[PDB]
């Protein structure tokens, strides 16, 4: 049961330094080399390099030589990526990925780590309910949600009912509101009869401000 | 096999 | 080194059809000794890491459906989908794995054409917690419509508004290929206290006439 778990998203100022961990579990670690892949926001995939799990030898793509370092900690089954002297161009999501046993493809991937490079400081969101009301009725179905307002930087994580509610959920791409802060809303459509027997809790996690909010969205009338 | 030898010749 | 040129950048097909995506190289990717190709196809659904689809240019990964077949060799490759389902909305990436540097392609974005779905429209007045905060966001929800083009207009006491609204559209849905839109109108509590009827007018091709959802402040 093989999992690659990466560290959480970070906001760092220009010139500062970041290290991202990638803890692998479920396989013999020193038999599979570890790749890193860069994805700029809204853009494609770029292969950064890979490090040998056995020997420790890194291999960098030409663009990433000099400001990037791959390291290992074998006793903890964990690969590390370090970016020095952070620039604006380093705002991206960084994936760790494993070489397959073939040596021909990348088999298991981490979930990504988003780094935002900005002089600005962290703002945690406020969370407000979008309660069902009968102004939220269509057909026989009701709509409800969470407004996640005034936060910086991306991402926020929204789940419903600790992840047990996925069907019919739309979490919208955030807008950049004119204050420079991001704002988002998450909505679900549910049956209107079951309001009053079902409970809907939106779980909001903004890691760069260490903000966790659970909000029970209750019917209005 | 391996695994730590990517590509054609490693 | 190996530059990976992918084609076309975005392509749009109807659900159920079969399609072709192309991956072209600079130099060949053939081993000459193992008679195997070092090309790999990857799929990236929105908000996820990439998933391994096909390795060795046609060998499928464990647990994959039998509707993805790519069979090229040398410098010309294609990935083909037998029956496109709504769950196959994603960007597809080829990767050179013959030699360093192990370059990716630009990606092919695959989008779905479906029939017209009228939006269902919901309006939410501001929460009392937020009105205690000093601001008031009123949200208008257009759910599960196709196509993407949709006009939304705010009317406060039947006065068309021109500032104060922001819109956001979802990606195409993994189950029914529709879109969802939110439009949020943001006023101060003070400006919000000065008006009564708040309405959201929605125009879309699935609606015979534009639909309005409204509330009066205080109910
Ligand atoms: Na919003």
Residue numbers in the entry:
A (entry chain A): 1 to 52, 52A, 53 to 82, 82A, 82B, 82C, 83 to 100, 100A, ...
B (entry chain Q): 3 to 12
C (entry chain B): 1 to 27, 27A, 27B, 27C, 27D, 27E, 27F, 28 to 213
Which sentences did the original study use to describe this structure?
Circumsporozoite protein (CSP) is the most abundant protein on the surface of all Plasmodium sporozoites and is necessary for parasite development and infection. CSP contains an unusual central region consisting of multiple, short amino acid repeats whose sequence depends on the Plasmodium species. The PvCSP central region is composed of nonapeptides GDRA(A/D)GQPA and ANGAGNQPG characteristic of strains VK210 and VK247, respectively. The central region of CSP is immunodominant, and antibodies targeting the repeats can inhibit sporozoite infection.
Unlike PvCSPvk210, PvCSPvk247 contains one predominant repeat motif; ‘ANGAGNQPG,’ with the exception of the first (EDGAGNQPG) and the last repeat (ANGAGGQAA) in the central region. Based on the binding stoichiometry derived from ITC, the 18-aa peptide 247-4 accommodates binding of one Fab, while 27-aa peptides 247-1, 247-2, and 247-3 are long enough to allow two Fabs to bind simultaneously. Bottom panel: comparison of the conformations of PvCSP247 peptides in X-ray crystal structures, with peptides 247-2, 247-3, and 247-4 depicted in yellow, orange, and teal, respectively. H-bonds are shown as black dashes, peptide 247-3 is shown in orange, HC is shown in green, and KC is shown in gray. Residue N6 of the PvCSPvk247 peptides is central to the interaction, forming four H-bonds with HCDR2 residues H.Thr30, H.Asn52, and H.Ser52A. Interestingly, HCDR3 H.Cys98 and H.Cys100 make a disulfide bond that positions H.Gly99 in an ideal position to form an H-bond with residue G9 of the peptide and mimic the stacking effect provided by aromatic sidechains.
